[PDB]
Short mmCIF file of C-alpha atoms in Angstrom, two decimals:
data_model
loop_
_atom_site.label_atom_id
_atom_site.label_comp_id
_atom_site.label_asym_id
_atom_site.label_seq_id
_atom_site.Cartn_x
_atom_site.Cartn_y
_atom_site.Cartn_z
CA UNK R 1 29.91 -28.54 17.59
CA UNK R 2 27.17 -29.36 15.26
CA UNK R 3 25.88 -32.39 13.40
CA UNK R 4 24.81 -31.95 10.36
CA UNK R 5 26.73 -28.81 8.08
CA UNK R 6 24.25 -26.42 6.60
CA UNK R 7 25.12 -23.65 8.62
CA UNK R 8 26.54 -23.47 12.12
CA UNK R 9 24.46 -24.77 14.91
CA UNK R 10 22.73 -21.53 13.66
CA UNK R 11 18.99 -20.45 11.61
CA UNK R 12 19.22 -23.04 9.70
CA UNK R 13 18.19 -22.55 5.80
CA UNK R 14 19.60 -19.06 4.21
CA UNK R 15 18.79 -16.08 2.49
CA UNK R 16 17.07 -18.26 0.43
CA UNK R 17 13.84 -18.26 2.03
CA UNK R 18 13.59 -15.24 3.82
CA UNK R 19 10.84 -14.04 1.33
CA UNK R 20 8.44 -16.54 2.46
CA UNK R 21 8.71 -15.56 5.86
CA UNK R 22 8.03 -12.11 5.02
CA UNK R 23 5.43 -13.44 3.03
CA UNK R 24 3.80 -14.50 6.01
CA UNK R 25 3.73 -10.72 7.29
CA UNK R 26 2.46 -10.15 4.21
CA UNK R 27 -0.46 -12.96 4.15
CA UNK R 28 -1.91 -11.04 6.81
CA UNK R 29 -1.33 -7.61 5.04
CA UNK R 30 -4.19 -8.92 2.96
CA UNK R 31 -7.09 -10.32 4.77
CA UNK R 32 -8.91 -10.87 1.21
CA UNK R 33 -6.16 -12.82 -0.01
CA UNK R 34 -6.90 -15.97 1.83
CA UNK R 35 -9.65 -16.23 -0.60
CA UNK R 36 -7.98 -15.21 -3.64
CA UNK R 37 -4.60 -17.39 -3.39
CA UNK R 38 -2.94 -16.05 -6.25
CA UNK R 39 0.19 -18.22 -6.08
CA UNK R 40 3.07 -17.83 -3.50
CA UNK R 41 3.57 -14.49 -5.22
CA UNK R 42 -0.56 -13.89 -4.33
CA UNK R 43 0.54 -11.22 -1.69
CA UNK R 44 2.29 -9.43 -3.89
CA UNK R 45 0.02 -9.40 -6.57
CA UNK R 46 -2.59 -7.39 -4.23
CA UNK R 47 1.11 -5.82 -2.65
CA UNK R 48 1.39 -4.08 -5.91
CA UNK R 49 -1.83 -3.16 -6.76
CA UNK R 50 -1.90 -1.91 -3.04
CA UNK R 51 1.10 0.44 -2.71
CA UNK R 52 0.06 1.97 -6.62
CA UNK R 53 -3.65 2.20 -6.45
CA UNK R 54 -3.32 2.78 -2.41
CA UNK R 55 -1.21 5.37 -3.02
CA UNK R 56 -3.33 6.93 -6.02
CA UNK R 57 -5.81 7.45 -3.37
CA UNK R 58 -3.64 9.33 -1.16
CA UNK R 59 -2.94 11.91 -3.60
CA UNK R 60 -6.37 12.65 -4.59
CA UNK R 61 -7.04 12.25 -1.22
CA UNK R 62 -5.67 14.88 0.73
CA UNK R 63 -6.20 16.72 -2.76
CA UNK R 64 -9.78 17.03 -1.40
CA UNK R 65 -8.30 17.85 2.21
CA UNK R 66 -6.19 20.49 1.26
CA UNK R 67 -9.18 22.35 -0.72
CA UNK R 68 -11.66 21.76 2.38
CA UNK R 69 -9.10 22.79 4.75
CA UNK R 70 -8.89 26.18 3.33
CA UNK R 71 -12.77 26.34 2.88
CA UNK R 72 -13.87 25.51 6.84
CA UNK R 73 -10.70 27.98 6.96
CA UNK R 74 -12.05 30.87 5.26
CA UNK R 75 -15.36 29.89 5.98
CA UNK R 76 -15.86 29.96 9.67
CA UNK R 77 -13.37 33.43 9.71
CA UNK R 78 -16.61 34.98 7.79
CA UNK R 79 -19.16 32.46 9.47
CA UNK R 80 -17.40 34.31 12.80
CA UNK R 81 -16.58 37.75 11.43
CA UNK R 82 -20.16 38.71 10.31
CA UNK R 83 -22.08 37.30 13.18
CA UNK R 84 -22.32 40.52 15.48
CA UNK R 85 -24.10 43.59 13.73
CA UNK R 86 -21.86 43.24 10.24
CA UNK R 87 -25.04 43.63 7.48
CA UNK F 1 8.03 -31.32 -30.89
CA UNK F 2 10.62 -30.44 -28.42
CA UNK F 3 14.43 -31.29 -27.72
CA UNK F 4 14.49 -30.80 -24.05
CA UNK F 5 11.49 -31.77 -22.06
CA UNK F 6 10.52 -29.03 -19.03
CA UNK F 7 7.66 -28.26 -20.47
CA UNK F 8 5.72 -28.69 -24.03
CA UNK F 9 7.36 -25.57 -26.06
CA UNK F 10 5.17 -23.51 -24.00
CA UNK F 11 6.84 -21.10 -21.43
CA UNK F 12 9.79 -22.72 -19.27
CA UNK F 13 10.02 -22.93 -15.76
CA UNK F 14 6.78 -23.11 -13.78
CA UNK F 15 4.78 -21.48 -10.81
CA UNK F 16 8.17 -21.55 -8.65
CA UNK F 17 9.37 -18.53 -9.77
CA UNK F 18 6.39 -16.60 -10.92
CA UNK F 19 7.35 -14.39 -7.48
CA UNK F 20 10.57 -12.98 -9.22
CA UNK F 21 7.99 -11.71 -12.07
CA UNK F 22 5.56 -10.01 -10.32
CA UNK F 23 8.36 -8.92 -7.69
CA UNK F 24 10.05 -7.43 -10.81
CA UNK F 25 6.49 -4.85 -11.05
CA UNK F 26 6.59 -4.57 -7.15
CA UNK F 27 10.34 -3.10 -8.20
CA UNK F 28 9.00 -0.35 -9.25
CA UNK F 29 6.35 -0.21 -6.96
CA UNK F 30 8.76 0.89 -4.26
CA UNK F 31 11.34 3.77 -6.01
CA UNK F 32 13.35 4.09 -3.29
CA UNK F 33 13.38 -0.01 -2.61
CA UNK F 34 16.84 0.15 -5.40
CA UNK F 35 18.67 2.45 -2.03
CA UNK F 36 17.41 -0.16 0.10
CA UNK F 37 18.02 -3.74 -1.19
CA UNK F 38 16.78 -5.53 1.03
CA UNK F 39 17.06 -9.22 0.60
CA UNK F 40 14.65 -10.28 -2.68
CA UNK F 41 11.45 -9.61 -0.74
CA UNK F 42 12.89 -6.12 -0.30
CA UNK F 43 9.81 -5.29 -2.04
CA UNK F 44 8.06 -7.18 0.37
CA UNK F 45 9.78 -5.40 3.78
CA UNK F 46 8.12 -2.17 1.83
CA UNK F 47 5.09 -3.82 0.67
CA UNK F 48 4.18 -5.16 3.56
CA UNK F 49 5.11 -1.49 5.38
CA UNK F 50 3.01 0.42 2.78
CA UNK F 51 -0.08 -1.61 2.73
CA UNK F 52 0.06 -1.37 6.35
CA UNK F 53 0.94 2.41 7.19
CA UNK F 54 -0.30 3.15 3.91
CA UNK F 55 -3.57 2.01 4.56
CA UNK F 56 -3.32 3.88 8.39
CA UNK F 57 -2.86 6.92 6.39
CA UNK F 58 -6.09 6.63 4.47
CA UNK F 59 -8.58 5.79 7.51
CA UNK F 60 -7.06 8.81 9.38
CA UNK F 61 -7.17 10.81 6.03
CA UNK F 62 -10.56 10.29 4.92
CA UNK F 63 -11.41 10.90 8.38
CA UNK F 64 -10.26 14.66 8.34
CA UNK F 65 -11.80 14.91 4.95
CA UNK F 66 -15.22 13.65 6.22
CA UNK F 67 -15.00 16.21 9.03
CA UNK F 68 -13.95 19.02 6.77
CA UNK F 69 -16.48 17.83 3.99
CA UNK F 70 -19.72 18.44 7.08
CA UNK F 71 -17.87 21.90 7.99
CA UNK F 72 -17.78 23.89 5.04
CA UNK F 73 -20.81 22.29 3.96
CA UNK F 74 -22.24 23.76 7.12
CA UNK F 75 -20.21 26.65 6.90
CA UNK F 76 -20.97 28.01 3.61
CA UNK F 77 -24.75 27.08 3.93
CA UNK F 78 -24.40 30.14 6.54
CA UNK F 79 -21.59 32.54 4.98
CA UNK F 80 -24.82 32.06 1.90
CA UNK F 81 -27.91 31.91 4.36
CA UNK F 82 -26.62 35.59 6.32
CA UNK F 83 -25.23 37.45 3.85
CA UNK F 84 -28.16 39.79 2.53
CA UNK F 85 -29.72 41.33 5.36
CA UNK F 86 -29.47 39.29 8.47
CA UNK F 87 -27.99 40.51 11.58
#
């Protein structure tokens, strides 16, 4: 059925490794990484100043979408119910 | 100066777990990540999601914020340039 034991006849290795492959999914997440190898863990050193600081910007993000959204909002229902003999 | 060798009295181990550590912040980095162990990169599976979709997010974002920003910009430079005798 199988030479060797390890597993059977099957992936070989476990969930041993399985980081490391993600990992690789990961290498690419960060394109700047390549150039700042930060040890195997180098992914997740940007990974967690990524999902934090990423999502920081997010927040205040939007923040600033929300309050425009309601401006053009309000702003083109005057901008539209002036124009027409209104002064 | 030492009983066991490893290292010199400095800190044990080396860079082969220096993941686990920085994993440990990425823990937190994902909340919900404790309802969904998944495998020790489970931060990773997330990480590499966030920085990813996260980072989708914020080009679309930005990009209604830019449009928004021009509009009531626009907007209220004529809801200010009418109002005071203008029809």
């Amino acid at each position: 059925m199988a030479d060797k034991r390890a597993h059977h006849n099957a992936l070989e290795r476990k969930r041993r490794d399985h980081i490391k492959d993600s990992f690789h999914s990961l290498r690419d997440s960060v394109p700047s990484l390549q150039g700042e190898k930060a040890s195997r863990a180098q992914i997740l050193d940007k990974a967690t100043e990524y999902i934090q600081y990423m999502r920081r910007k997010v927040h205040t993000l939007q923040q600033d979408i929300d309050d425009l959204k309601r401006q053009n909002a309000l702003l083109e229902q005057q901008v539209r119910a002036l124009e027409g003999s209104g002064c």
